[PDB]
Amino acid sequence: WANVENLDSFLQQVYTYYTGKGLSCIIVHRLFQILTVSFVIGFTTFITSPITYLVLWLFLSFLLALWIYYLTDIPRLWQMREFYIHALKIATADMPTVSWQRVLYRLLKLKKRLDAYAIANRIMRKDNYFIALINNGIINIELPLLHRRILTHTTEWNINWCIFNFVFDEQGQLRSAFRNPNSRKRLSEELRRRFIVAGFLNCLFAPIVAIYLVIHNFFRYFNEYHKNPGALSTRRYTPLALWTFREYNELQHFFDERINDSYAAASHYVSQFPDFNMIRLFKYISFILGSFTAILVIITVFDPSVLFYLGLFGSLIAVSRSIIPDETLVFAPEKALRRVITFTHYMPGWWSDNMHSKAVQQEFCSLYSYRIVNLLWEILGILLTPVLLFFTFPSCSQDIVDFFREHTINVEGVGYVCSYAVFQ
Amino acid sequence: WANVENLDSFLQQVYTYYTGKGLSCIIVHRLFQILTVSFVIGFTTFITSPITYLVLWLFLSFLLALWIYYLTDIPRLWQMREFYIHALKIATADMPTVSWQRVLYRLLKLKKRLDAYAIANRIMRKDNYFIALINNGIINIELPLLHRRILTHTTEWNINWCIFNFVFDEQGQLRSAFRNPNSRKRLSEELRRRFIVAGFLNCLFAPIVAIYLVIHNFFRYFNEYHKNPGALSTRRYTPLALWTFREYNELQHFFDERINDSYAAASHYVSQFPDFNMIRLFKYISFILGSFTAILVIITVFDPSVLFYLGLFGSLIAVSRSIIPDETLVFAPEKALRRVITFTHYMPGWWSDNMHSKAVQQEFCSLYSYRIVNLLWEILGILLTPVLLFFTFPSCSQDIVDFFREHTINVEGVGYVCSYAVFQ
Amino acid sequence: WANVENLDSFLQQVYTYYTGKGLSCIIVHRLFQILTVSFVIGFTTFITSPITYLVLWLFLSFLLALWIYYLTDIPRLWQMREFYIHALKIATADMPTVSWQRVLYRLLKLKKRLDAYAIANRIMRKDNYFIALINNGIINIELPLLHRRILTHTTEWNINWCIFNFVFDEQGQLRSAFRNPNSRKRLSEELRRRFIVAGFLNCLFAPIVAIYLVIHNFFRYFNEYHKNPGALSTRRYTPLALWTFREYNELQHFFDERINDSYAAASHYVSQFPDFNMIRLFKYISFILGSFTAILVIITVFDPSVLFYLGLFGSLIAVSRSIIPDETLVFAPEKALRRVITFTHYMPGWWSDNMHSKAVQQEFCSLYSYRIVNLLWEILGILLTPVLLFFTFPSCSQDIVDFFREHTINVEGVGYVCSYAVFQ
Ligand SMILES: CCCCCCCCCCC(CCCCCCCCCC)(CO[C@H]1O[C@@H](CO)[C@H](O[C@@H]2O[C@@H](CO)[C@H](O)[C@@H](O)[C@@H]2O)[C@@H](O)[C@@H]1O)CO[C@H]1O[C@@H](CO)[C@H](O[C@@H]2O[C@@H](CO)[C@H](O)[C@@H](O)[C@@H]2O)[C@@H](O)[C@H]1O
Ligand SMILES: CCCCCCCCCCC(CCCCCCCCCC)(CO[C@H]1O[C@@H](CO)[C@H](O[C@@H]2O[C@@H](CO)[C@H](O)[C@@H](O)[C@@H]2O)[C@@H](O)[C@@H]1O)CO[C@H]1O[C@@H](CO)[C@H](O[C@@H]2O[C@@H](CO)[C@H](O)[C@@H](O)[C@@H]2O)[C@@H](O)[C@H]1O
Ligand SMILES: CCCCCCCCCCC(CCCCCCCCCC)(CO[C@H]1O[C@@H](CO)[C@H](O[C@@H]2O[C@@H](CO)[C@H](O)[C@@H](O)[C@@H]2O)[C@@H](O)[C@@H]1O)CO[C@H]1O[C@@H](CO)[C@H](O[C@@H]2O[C@@H](CO)[C@H](O)[C@@H](O)[C@@H]2O)[C@@H](O)[C@H]1O
Ligand SMILES: CCCCCCCCCCC(CCCCCCCCCC)(CO[C@H]1O[C@@H](CO)[C@H](O[C@@H]2O[C@@H](CO)[C@H](O)[C@@H](O)[C@@H]2O)[C@@H](O)[C@@H]1O)CO[C@H]1O[C@@H](CO)[C@H](O[C@@H]2O[C@@H](CO)[C@H](O)[C@@H](O)[C@@H]2O)[C@@H](O)[C@H]1O
Ligand SMILES: CCCCCCCCCCC(CCCCCCCCCC)(CO[C@H]1O[C@@H](CO)[C@H](O[C@@H]2O[C@@H](CO)[C@H](O)[C@@H](O)[C@@H]2O)[C@@H](O)[C@@H]1O)CO[C@H]1O[C@@H](CO)[C@H](O[C@@H]2O[C@@H](CO)[C@H](O)[C@@H](O)[C@@H]2O)[C@@H](O)[C@H]1O
Ligand SMILES: CCCCCCCCCCC(CCCCCCCCCC)(CO[C@H]1O[C@@H](CO)[C@H](O[C@@H]2O[C@@H](CO)[C@H](O)[C@@H](O)[C@@H]2O)[C@@H](O)[C@@H]1O)CO[C@H]1O[C@@H](CO)[C@H](O[C@@H]2O[C@@H](CO)[C@H](O)[C@@H](O)[C@@H]2O)[C@@H](O)[C@H]1O
């Protein structure tokens, strides 16, 4: 590896081999991914059975492209596995459980600079620019009519292809033409001619991706969402909430740990806002039905459709007892919210006034939505991303170019990084 | 509010509007309260159907008095809601979740002194005297024959009407005649002529209140206590335990929070005292029945009323497994008790010797009783309070007067407070 | 002050009015400064008494220029005094003792951003670039032949006139042409044509400044350095040591406090390196002379030029006792050095190996020199600065330009600051 001369991509591959947990796990996951896609395709073309033949040929050609890419990438995985076993001296059996600090320790042992912070800046060199574009509103992801900021996975794929393939070298570093203030008019017009091409390609590949996605999600979740409604209120952070919470140089797996360790706190928080005027009503109704049931039971022990009424009242009382919280339950929304914020690290300025508020809870529930709503939006966004790539993104092209010139700072030994990554 | 000149009652109304959680919640609770009373009355007069007409007229006249009082009080609630929205700038939607410290912050912003501690001393000016009368034995609430200290809700209503209406101004402050040591013989005899009148009124309104209370509690709890015995061992603090734990100037909702946050610790503590000589016996019996069942099952797999015996033994073994605790369970009564005391703040002097003891647990279970026992005593105390108001309270009248003269201290900017409130 | 539009210079004037401690103290100091200069001139032209008339006319013309400038600047001082009394509400009697945090508090009360850190970045906007040029070797201040880094006060005056008058606006901010990478060849050649002009002016004003300086220092220090040699070993930090210790955005008076609070630690540290092979010799010599003196005193009490020998031996023994340290004295150079570094905040990388070392002490004594050596070098540097401005500075001109383009970062609300000021 002494002849890399492309240290950024090498470190990124080291990291994605770590988070993939070795060649075995990576190959297994990719295999089951293409198997799931192919099963969806085959089962959908079976239960429904010219135009059908042509669209099936299209789908299977995409599947074969995926397969061919995976087969092409296998050798790079082997090179990295060899680098892990031999150079890093990390056992193939230690992969699913070794930490990133241990890999960093071995990597510093093996060998301008390779500090932990430097390696984080080199792995996340483009992700930091993405965090800074999204969080600072440099790029407008708000729909023109629906008035909503949506960040699907196709949105960020298109952002990474239009911008970060155009702004960064093949060697993976900010091109020279993006700090020259005189070229700000040529680049800011060769960038709209990329947004337009990506919008054209998405207007062709977005229907046949949203269709596959809705079919896959239906097949996967129909069983649970019609035979287990308890798992219908499972809440998760929206994909835009996961880029609002992200910090700079915070590698993906650290972020995943500290976000998964926050769902307990968030589920607790969103429950600290009961409806007392409704709890009181249901307490009253439970009292009435309990009086009726007491009379009925005390009269049936002396005269053995009163059983229908007894069953109905038992059902209604069991319904009511679920709404009525425990007596010895202390509701404290502000400390629940602070317990959440110790994980999400995200407290807007105007929260600090009223963290007990209900408006704060409305906002946090805009960030922490239902999983089914997240699915509906991850399907509608694949359709509405061409709207962005045609109407809101070109108008924001100039700014983007300027953002890469103003807010780029040279950190010695790393290179040109985002200027926001060096503050926080 | 610049023309109040009755700051104590104004602050008390601010506080009870806070703890009632706004005009909406207060009105809803009062409405469902009169609805529950009226439903009990109507259903009891229905399932049972002169004397009946007369007693029904009496009950409905009391109900109408309650209704008329609530309708009379509504305008004061509106005045306070206006003061909350306009002057305090607390949103009507922030009421169920705003804290008392936020209300104090707004109230100090708006405007002798209005510190947090001063407002607590003005809201709890009579409650501090009550805590000091009850905890220091100035007033004797021990029954003459049953030899038990009972503090029902009617007991404290009678104490607040006999004493605190006679001792405190209409403006809500210690009358002047109660610090003059020469009038200690006139006041200590105009106070027995109040205990006697209250005893006479209670000997008339105590039967028709205990009757309503037992009917209400029967209707409410018969369903749960005959169809869910698991909620028969629900333990709660007796009303006298809640005045023993109360601290001075600790507003009601803080006390409620720290008492509700103690039921987990108390339930844990009362379980750290198993019967080892009984656990051993049930372990032996489970072993015997398991041997029998093993033989029976191993003999029925070769010869398919042995099923009756198998079912009976399964039932008995399931019974036995519930008593036998887990093996890896560590019983530690002293640290459980300390975990409780960190909430109740109540450790008598003689506990500090043996907090591992069983006598300490007997006392704490006198404080932390069963809810059904609490109901039986809250019904028997409504009957036995005239005994107090006739025989034990007059004999303790003199002391009471002296208590208000000796143990009153003038805190500057607040007024005459209890001398115990300023120590702890 | 709402119409300033030159916030940087306004804040710098606020700060220099604070550190000057009011109009009274500023005027008094300037007055005694011109009085000291004029006294030196008059006394030197008196004790020595064409060429004399001409050089005296030159000196007095410089004095009159200084006087005229002070008289010109008085009105700005009055404007700032009014701003301090009226707007800031800081009493004229509170000036010599008010802190900078109190001035910051008042200034934030009065009114893109005016945080403490922002005001520090605006006051020290050019000083941060100076710290970064000097500490990072962007500019070469090492003499070509003597091989020594000298930073006189004239050196930094010339740096501030050649560079910071050319690089920064009249409004006080980095000119636009210094971030355009295409103009790096025009600016890097209009900067050598400034170093050359400054070298020419210094080759004319350096003799008649070094002469005045040596005369002033002779007059001031001859008395103390010939009639009090105890104040000849007074050590101070060299002017280059005071730019090596300086941190970014550390205002001048904070730096002065933490450097003055370090001279005790430095004086302690430089004494932890005694010469044991010399202490032993002087102990032996003191023993010999004490034996001789004991014999002489015990023989003169029986036979009253032995007195000459007794006096000489007393003198030599008094000399020896000064070198020999106390017995109960514990020498610990490493913790003395750490006590120093807690103030200077300056520990090179190669110190961390051997902080007990003698080479570390040699380096620290290169930083912490004798005051008389500092005077000799502050006089020789005024002569040798044209050498820098002619031979070492032009060769380093290009780099300087690049330094202002590479290492400039835009902090929002402040402006273009040095990129090193935002790290540490
Ligand atoms: C005719 C078929 C049409 C569509 C086919 C299927 C859709 C496309 C799938 C392909 C592909 C993009 C890349 C292709 C690049 C190959 C080059 C192509 C040829 C170029 C010549 C999907 O990538 C995205 O697909 C999205 C759906 O399309 C998913 O959205 C979801 O929607 C809802 C669903 O439940 C969800 O609720 C919602 O939460 C999602 O937002 C995303 O989750 C996913 O990231 C695969 O790449 C990626 O897949 C993901 C796991 O998916 C892998 O994540 C992790 O990997 C390990 C960490 O390294 C971890 O250890 C591992 O734990 C983890 O899995 C990635 O590593 C990577 O492998
Ligand atoms: C009709 C056939 C359907 C075919 C659909 C397209 C098939 C091609 C997909 C291939 C392709 C898009 C590229 C070409 C797209 C051109 C326009 C596409 C328009 C559609 C016509 C998607 O593939 C990527 O998708 C990403 C999203 O899941 C995954 O990131 C996961 O996220 C976490 C989840 O939370 C997981 O936890 C984590 O383990 C994964 O990292 C990747 O693992 C995956 O490889 C590969 O490019 C990718 O390069 C890299 C940056 O160089 C970017 O990957 C990530 O970005 C950050 C995000 O988080 C991550 O921080 C960072 O880790 C990573 O850098 C992507 O931006 C993407 O650009
Ligand atoms: C012909 C009918 C005969 C009897 C009728 C019903 C009995 C009397 C009910 C009337 C009334 C006294 C005041 C009357 C003043 C009006 C003036 C009258 C006209 C004057 C011209 C009951 O007051 C007491 O009644 C006792 C029973 O009698 C209860 O004992 C119980 O027994 C067992 C039961 O389950 C229990 O197990 C046991 O734990 C109890 O000890 C007590 O809990 C209760 O305090 C109503 O006042 C009070 O009610 C209570 C909630 O009850 C309100 O508490 C809170 O309010 C909010 C904080 O501000 C909170 O936010 C809210 O959460 C909370 O609710 C108070 O605010 C206040 O409203
Ligand atoms: C045949 C028809 C049946 C009619 C029965 C009587 C109907 C009249 C009841 C009306 C009346 C009694 C007054 C007249 C009684 C005369 C003799 C009665 C003999 C019966 C013939 C009861 O009404 C009160 O009862 C209290 C008890 O629940 C409630 O306090 C709740 O406690 C917590 C629970 O734990 C809750 O959490 C909390 O939210 C509530 O505060 C009050 O909310 C309620 O208003 C109103 O007067 C009341 O004034 C105030 C102090 O000026 C006192 O209230 C409280 O005291 C402290 C205790 O804790 C509290 O610290 C303090 O907050 C408050 O100051 C009472 O002492 C009482 O005197
Ligand atoms: C024909 C005569 C030839 C020469 C004349 C005399 C030499 C020049 C003197 C003028 C002048 C430069 C500025 C002129 C600007 C006016 C505009 C001109 C007209 C433009 C149209 C000297 O400035 C420098 O002069 C150097 C010598 O030249 C000194 O070097 C010394 O050498 C050895 C000596 O002992 C030393 O050992 C060695 O340690 C030094 O390095 C430096 O100490 C001094 O900084 C005055 O400016 C500055 O003086 C200094 C105190 O001097 C003031 O420092 C502080 O002020 C307060 C904090 O705000 C503090 O509260 C106050 O405590 C403190 O005092 C500054 O505020 C400022 O006022
Ligand atoms: C034949 C007649 C002799 C006439 C000789 C020249 C007379 C002119 C002198 C006037 C002039 C030089 C300007 C023109 C020079 C052109 C070329 C000169 C060639 C000579 C032919 C010197 O005047 C300054 O000299 C400084 C040095 O003492 C003083 O700083 C003191 O340092 C501490 C000590 O340790 C004291 O503690 C502290 O209180 C003082 O701040 C200043 O107080 C003083 O005003 C005024 O310009 C000045 O502007 C400012 C930055 O805008 C700079 O001041 C400081 O720089 C940092 C340093 O530390 C400081 O951090 C910072 O506080 C301040 O910003 C200077 O760089 C200088 O440029």
C-alpha distances (whole Å) from C284 to each of B79, C281, C294 are: 99, 5, 15
What DSSP designation does C171 have?
A: S
> Is the CB of residue C273 less than 8 Å from the CB of residue C361?
yes
- Tell the residue number behind the tokens 């006392």, with chain if given: B363
Give a three-class secondary structure readout of B211-239: HHHHHHHHHHHHHHHHHCHHHHCCEEECC
Which residue's CA is the closest to the ligand 1 atom numbered 51? A33
Distance of CA A30 to the CA centre of its chain: 19
Q: Residue ranges of the alpha helices (H) in B4-99? A: 7-19, 22-47, 51-82
Q: Which long-range contacts (CB under 8 A, 24 or more apart) does B219-226 make?
A: B219/A287, B219/A290, B219/A291, B219/A294, B219/B40, B219/B43, B220/A287, B220/A290, B220/A291, B221/B372, B221/B375, B222/A290, B222/A294, B222/A297, B222/A298, B223/A290, B223/A293, B223/A294, B223/A297, B223/A317, B224/A290, B225/B372, B226/A297
Surface-to-core class of residue A361, CB atoms within 10 Å of its CB (0-12 exposed, 13-18 middle, 19+ buried): buried
* Residue in C178, C57, C56, C58 with CA at minimum distance from that of residue C129: C178
Rounded Cα–Cα distance for residues B192 and A329 (Å): 42
C-alpha distances (whole Å) from B373 to each of B142, B378, C333, C407 are: 18, 8, 77, 79
Rounded Cα–Cα distance for residues A227 and A212 (Å): 23
Quick check: helix, strand or coil at residue A233? coil
- Which ligand is the nearest neighbour of the Cα of B25? 3
Strands (E), A28-175: none
**CB–CB contact B28 A327 (8 Å):** no
Taking each helix axis as running N to C, give the angle between helix A371-387 and helix A153-162, from 0 to 180 degrees, rounded to the nearest 10.
Answer: 40
Method: cryo-EM
Paired tokens of A32: 């089951």
Amino acid at site C391 = F
> Is the CB of residue B136 less than 8 Å from the CB of residue B424?
no
Q: Which residues contact B67 (CB under 8 A, 6 or more apart)?
A: B34
Q: How many CA atoms does the CB half-sphere of B320 hold within 13 Å?
A: 19
- Tell the residue number behind the tokens 């001279």, with chain if given: C263
> Is the CB of residue B385 less than 8 Å from the CB of residue B202?
yes
Which residue's CA is the closest to the ligand 6 atom numbered 10? C157
Q: Which residues contact C239 (CB under 8 A, 6 or more apart)?
A: C151, C152, C153, C374, C378
- Residue B255 backbone phi and psi in degrees, to 5: -60, -40
3-state helix, strand, coil split of chain A in percent (to 5) is 70, 5, 25
Paired tokens of A255: 């972020």
Give a three-class secondary structure readout of C271-318: CCCCCHHHHHHHHHHHHHHHHHHHHHHHHHCCCCCHHHHHHHHHHHHH
* Residue in C382, C350, C377, C381 with CA at minimum distance from that of residue C364: C350
Quick check: helix, strand or coil at residue B142? strand
- Of C181, C182, C419, nearest to A409 by CB-CB distance is C419
Quick check: helix, strand or coil at residue B416? strand
> Is the CB of residue A344 less than 8 Å from the CB of residue A213?
no
CB atoms within 10 A of CB C384: 22
- State in Å: Cα B213 to ligand 3 middle: 12
Rounded Cα–Cα distance for residues C291 and C309 (Å): 13
Which residue's CA is the closest to the ligand 5 atom numbered 37? C375
Paired tokens of B300: 């029925």
Return the best residue to mutate from B16, B60, B157 for the ligand 4 pocket (most ligand atoms within 8 A of CB): B157
Distance of CA A364 to the CA centre of its chain: 16
Q: Please state the atom number of ligand 4 nearest to the C-alpha of residue B161.
A: 16
- Residue B421 backbone phi and psi in degrees, to 5: -65, -25
Amino acid at site C159 = I
Amino acid at site B338 = R
Greatest Cα-to-Cα distance within chain C, rounded to the nearest angstrom: 98
Based on its alpha-carbon atoms, the radius of gyration of chain C, rounded to whole angstroms, reads 27
Paired tokens of C329: 């004295």
Paired tokens of C167: 């690089």
Rounded Cα–Cα distance for residues A140 and A394 (Å): 10
Amino acid at site C308 = F
Amino acid at site B202 = N
Do C and A share at least 3 CB pairs under 8 Å? yes
CB atoms within 10 A of CB C92: 12
Quick check: helix, strand or coil at residue A29? helix
CB atoms within 10 A of CB B88: 19
> Is the CB of residue A384 less than 8 Å from the CB of residue A391?
no
Which chain B positions have a beta carbon within 8 Å of A291's beta carbon? 39-40, 43, 219-220
In sign, the C-alpha dihedral spanning C306, C307, C312, C317 is: positive
Provide the pairing of β-strand B415-418 with B408-411. Answer: antiparallel
Amino acid at site C384 = L
- Residue B271 backbone phi and psi in degrees, to 5: -100, -5
Paired tokens of B3: 């023309």
Paired tokens of B262: 């103690």
Bridge partners, C174 (sequence order): C168
* Residue in C393, C382, C12 with CA at minimum distance from that of residue C168: C12
Chains that touch C (3 or more CB pairs under 8 A): A
**CB–CB contact C407 A407 (8 Å):** no
> Is the CB of residue B49 less than 8 Å from the CB of residue B67?
no
- Of A180, A409, A419, nearest to C181 by CB-CB distance is A180
Rounded Cα–Cα distance for residues B334 and B350 (Å): 14
C-alpha distances (whole Å) from B78 to each of A275, B81, B376 are: 21, 5, 39
- Tell the residue number behind the tokens 């004029």, with chain if given: C38
- Of A179, A410, A419, nearest to C181 by CB-CB distance is A179
Q: Is the CB of B127 under 6 A from ligand 4?
A: yes
Which chain B positions have a beta carbon within 8 Å of A293's beta carbon? 223
Which residue's CA is the closest to the ligand 1 atom numbered 41? A153
- In chain A, the N- to C-terminal Cα span, in Å, equals 32
Bridge partners, A369 (sequence order): A236
Paired tokens of B399: 């002391």
Rounded Cα–Cα distance for residues A79 and A115 (Å): 23
Paired tokens of A89: 């001296």
Which chain B positions have a beta carbon within 8 Å of A276's beta carbon? 21, 25, 28, 96
Rounded Cα–Cα distance for residues C237 and C365 (Å): 9
Q: Which residues contact C165 (CB under 8 A, 6 or more apart)?
A: none
CA distance C127 to chain A (A): 20
Amino acid at site C62 = F
* Residue in A307, A324, A326, A286 with CA at minimum distance from that of residue B39: A286
